[PDB]
Amino acid sequence: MEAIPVKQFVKHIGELYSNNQHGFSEDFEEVQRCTADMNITAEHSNHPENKHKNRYINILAYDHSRVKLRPLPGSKHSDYINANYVDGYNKAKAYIATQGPLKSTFEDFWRMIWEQNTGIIVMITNLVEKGRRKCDQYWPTENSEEYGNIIVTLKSTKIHACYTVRRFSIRNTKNERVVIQYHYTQWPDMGVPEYALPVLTFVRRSSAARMPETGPVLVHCSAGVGRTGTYIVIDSMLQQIKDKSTVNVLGFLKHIRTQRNYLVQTEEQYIFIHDALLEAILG
Numbered sequence: 379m380e381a382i383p384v385k386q387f388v389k390h391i392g393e394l395y396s397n398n399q400h401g402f403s404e405d406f407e408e409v410q411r412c413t414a415d416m417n418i419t420a421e422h423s424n425h426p427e428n429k430h431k432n433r434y435i436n437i438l439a440y441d442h443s444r445v446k447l448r449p450l451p452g453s454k455h456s457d458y459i460n461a462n463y464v465d466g467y468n469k470a471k472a473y474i475a476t477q478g479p480l481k482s483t484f485e486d487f488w489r490m491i492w493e494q495n496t497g498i499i500v501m502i503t504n505l506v507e508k509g510r511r512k513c514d515q516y517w518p519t520e521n522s523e524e525y526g527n528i529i530v531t532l533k534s535t536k537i538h539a540c541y542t543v544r545r546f547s548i549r550n551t552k553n554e555r556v557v558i559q560y561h562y563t564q565w566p567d568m569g570v571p572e573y574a575l576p577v578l579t580f581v582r583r584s585s586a587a588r589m590p591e592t593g594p595v596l597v598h599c600s601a602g603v604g605r606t607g608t609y610i611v612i613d614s615m616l617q618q619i620k621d622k623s624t625v626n627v628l629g630f631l632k633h634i635r636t637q638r639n640y641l642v643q644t645e646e647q648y649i650f651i652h653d654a655l656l657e658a659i660l661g
């Protein structure tokens with residue numbers, strides 16, 4: 379669609395900041411309303427047998443783009459996980475955006491990873507933030523843990539200033555696959571990171587870890603919409619910039635909003651997307 383050249387984008391940024399960022403605020407208000415004339419169904423999300431599988435009652439997975447698990451013999455809603463396919467730059471279903479797993483969905487989570495042939499997990503939340511539970515620990519602290527038919531083994535860990543990388547082997551007892559978890563650990567309990575550069579490095583390193591041809595990269599935070607959407611837009615726009623030297627943040631964001639509710643949840647995040655791209659463009 380309407381992509382603009384990097385040079386123009388770079389002037390456009392200053393205009394968005396100018397009058398108190400009234401521009402950014404108007405853009406994001408446009409994103410918020412972009413699906414207002416779109417009734418998108420989420421029937422499986424709202425089904426009673428599935429209610430315990432949602433971390434947040436108001437954060438749903440749209441039906442048309444939801445990831446389906448293969449049905450289990452025995453129930454009629456065992457295909458459900460709160461997770462949607464999301465497009466990336468020049469590729470459909472480049473990501474799976476999902477909530478932070480609950481103990482009750484650990485098996486579903488890892489089965490989904492197995493079935494989708496996912497090789498990369500991007501986690502952008504701490505387990506607990508400001509005293510509040512945000513995600514349950516769905517991986518082994520050391521050695522191995524069993525989640526249904528999938529056994530996960532921690533092979534190694536590197537802990538950087540702002541993010542942690544865990545290498546796992548996972549095996550379906552019906553260890554067969556490598557899964558790399560990139561875990562950003564310095565998102566503040568309030569608001570957005572103060573400097574984009576660390577996030578930028580995180581995105582580049584985690585995006586580069588993507589092998590041809592694995593399944594979608596799984597990206598989650600707590601709800602799987604705010605930091606998750608921000609990661610997705612930043613990663614996708616860096617792709618487009620590298621590829622065509624153009625950028626379409628607003629267009630892309632309005633597009634993926636049809637694929638999962640609330641992606642890029644706050645105006646601060648919408649602005650932080652631009653801080654990050656500008657640093658990548660200048661640096």
Ligand code: VO4
Binds near residue numbers: 598600602606643
């Ligand atoms: O955990 V998020 O609120 O960034 O969706």
